[PDB]
Amino acid sequence: KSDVTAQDVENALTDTSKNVELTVWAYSAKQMEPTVKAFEKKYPHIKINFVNTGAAEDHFTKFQNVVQAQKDIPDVVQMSANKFQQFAVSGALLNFANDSIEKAWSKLYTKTAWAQVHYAGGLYGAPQDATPLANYVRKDILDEHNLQVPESWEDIYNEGIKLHKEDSNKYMGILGSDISFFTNLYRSVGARLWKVNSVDDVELTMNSGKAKEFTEFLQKCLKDGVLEGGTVFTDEFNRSINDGRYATFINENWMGNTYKEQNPSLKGKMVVAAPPSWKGQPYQSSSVGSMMSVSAACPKEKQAAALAFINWLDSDKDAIQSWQDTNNGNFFMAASVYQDDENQRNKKETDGYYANDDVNAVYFDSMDKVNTDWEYLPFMSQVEVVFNDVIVPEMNENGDLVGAMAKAQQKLKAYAEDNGFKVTTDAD
Numbered sequence: 001k002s003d004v005t006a007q008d009v010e011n012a013l014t015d016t017s018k019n020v021e022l023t024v025w026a027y028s029a030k031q032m033e034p035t036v037k038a039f040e041k042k043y044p045h046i047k048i049n050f051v052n053t054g055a056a057e058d059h060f061t062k063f064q065n066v067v068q069a070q071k072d073i074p075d076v077v078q079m080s081a082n083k084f085q086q087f088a089v090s091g092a093l094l095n096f097a098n099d100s101i102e103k104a105w106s107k108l109y110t111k112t113a114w115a116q117v118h119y120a121g122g123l124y125g126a127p128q129d130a131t132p133l134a135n136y137v138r139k140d141i142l143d144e145h146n147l148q149v150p151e152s153w154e155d156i157y158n159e160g161i162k163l164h165k166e167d168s169n170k171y172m173g174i175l176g177s178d179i180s181f182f183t184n185l186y187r188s189v190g191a192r193l194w195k196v197n198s199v200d201d202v203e204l205t206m207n208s209g210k211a212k213e214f215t216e217f218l219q220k221c222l223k224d225g226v227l228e229g230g231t232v233f234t235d236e237f238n239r240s241i242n243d244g245r246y247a248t249f250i251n252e253n254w255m256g257n258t259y260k261e262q263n264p265s266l267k268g269k270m271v272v273a274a275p276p277s278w279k280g281q282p283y284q285s286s287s288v289g290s291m292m293s294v295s296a297a298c299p300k301e302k303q304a305a306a307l308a309f310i311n312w313l314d315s316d317k318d319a320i321q322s323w324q325d326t327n328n329g330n331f332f333m334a335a336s337v338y339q340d341d342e343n344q345r346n347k348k349e350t351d352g353y354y355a356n357d358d359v360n361a362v363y364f365d366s367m368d369k370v371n372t373d374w375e376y377l378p379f380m381s382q383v384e385v386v387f388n389d390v391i392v393p394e395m396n397e398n399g400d401l402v403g404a405m406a407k408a409q410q411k412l413k414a415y416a417e418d419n420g421f422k423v424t425t426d427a428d
């Protein structure tokens with residue numbers, strides 16, 4: 001049990017005669033680094049060796065490599081709420097849970113985000129951004145085809161048929177071959193793929209209930225030309241954005257900033273709308289986001305300063321303001337000083353980029369509707385491998401996503417059993 005208390009963390013910042021060097025690895029260097037520099041200016045006794053690890057996929061592989069070698073491990077490492085699990089369960093990350101930290105830091109982060117940085121009773125990071133889903137809609141394309149901004153998956157289907165019949169170079173949306181994109185859709189309609197009871201006890205429901213119904217719907221959308229299967233955040237996707245290939249894009253809301261940065265020519269053409277409802281339920285959402293974690297290898301005499309850094313970067317009021325000023329005036333932060341500020345909720349756009357100026361109100365309503373009835377599996381790295389090998393190849397106009405979900409469940413059951421997890425599946 002970690003004996004680094006909330007007071008010990010604060011002492012690392014006030015005890016300026018105690019110089020520390022911290023190595024910090026991050027994939028989201030573009031959005032984060034100016035605020036890291038602000039930390040260093042404020043606390044010159046804590047020097048930050050900031051390492052941009054490149055693409056997220058390369059970051060996670062690099063970190064696994066150093067952990068297994070037990071050598072050259074960073075003190076602080078960027079994680080995410082749906083990819084940290086396998087690192088936490090394998091002992092790569094410091095579990096810094098204790099009563100003092102829980103009492104103090106729980107007041108600093110919105111409860112949906114604070115729950116998700118726990119796993120198996122341990123506490124593994126400070127939440128960074130929250131990522132409620134938004135539908136980024138090419139309103140110009142919909143207007144041209146006499147189509148309404150869709151509020152439901154039913155509308156996406158019905159209007160999508162009309163769009164693609166009239167203009168076979170455009171699709172209503174993309175079904176993205178990315179584990180976050182795909183699982184976020186299921187979570188946002190209340191369709192559990194699995195349930196976690198303890199670190200060693202899991203239930204897989206990938207071929208039954210609401211999940212199966214939603215898979216059947218996604219497959220019909222692919223077959224009928226409503227959604228196109230393809231990669232996200234690749235050059236193929238980047239070209240499709242500029243080309244207007246997708247009338248809608250339902251995604252984690254950091255993308256709202258990405259469009260402003262990479263697609264200036266789309267100014268005035270998009271609306272930011274709520275993600276869609278399903279079967280006449282009120283709409284729900286999903287939020288994942290990044291987190292900053294401490295490695296299990298971090299030396300004991302560096303741990304208080306490492307924790308002070310992650311808490312400052314992710315919740316200090318000056319840091320939160322820096323996150324806004326250095327990312328086009330908005331970044332959607334989990335800190336309560338952002339989430340509880342009614343002037344963030346009612347913040348108006350002023351750059352003219354989106355056709356609606358109430359973008360943050362849309363993001364905050366979606367955050368309010370996040371489906372919290374959800375856990376990620378202990379082995380999320382293996383989940384992404386199986387998704388890539390088994391599910392992604394069926395994301396096409398003739399695909400059998402239903403059969404692929406059942407085969408992926410079988411592979412995950414075998415992996416769970418081989419690694420000592422108790423597992424049930426809906427095929428048992």
Ligand SMILES: C[C@@H]1O[C@]2(O[C@@H]3[C@@H](O)[C@H](O)O[C@H](CO)[C@H]3O[C@@]3(O[C@H]4[C@H](O2)[C@@H](O)[C@@H](O)O[C@@H]4CO)O[C@H](CO)[C@H](O)[C@H](O)[C@H]3O)[C@@H](O)[C@H](O)[C@@H]1O
Binds near residue numbers: 080252254
């Ligand atoms: C790995 C990834 O981390 C989290 O998503 C990242 C966001 O938190 C961050 O703000 O923005 C990144 C993109 O610039 C996201 O990664 C992309 O990574 C996201 C992060 O997502 C965000 O927290 C934030 O840092 O922005 C980056 C993109 O600039 O996430 C997508 C999945 O949506 C995909 O993995 C890309 O390769 C990443 O670059 C989580 O929220 C994600 O679900 C995921 O775990």
Ligand SMILES: [Zn+2]
Binds near residue numbers: 102118
């Ligand atoms: Zn707790």
Ligand SMILES: [Zn+2]
Binds near residue numbers: 144
């Ligand atoms: Zn058209």
Ligand SMILES: [Zn+2]
Binds near residue numbers: 168
């Ligand atoms: Zn077609």
Ligand SMILES: [Zn+2]
Binds near residue numbers: 234235236
């Ligand atoms: Zn390419």
Ligand SMILES: [Zn+2]
Binds near residue numbers: 316317318319
């Ligand atoms: Zn401050």
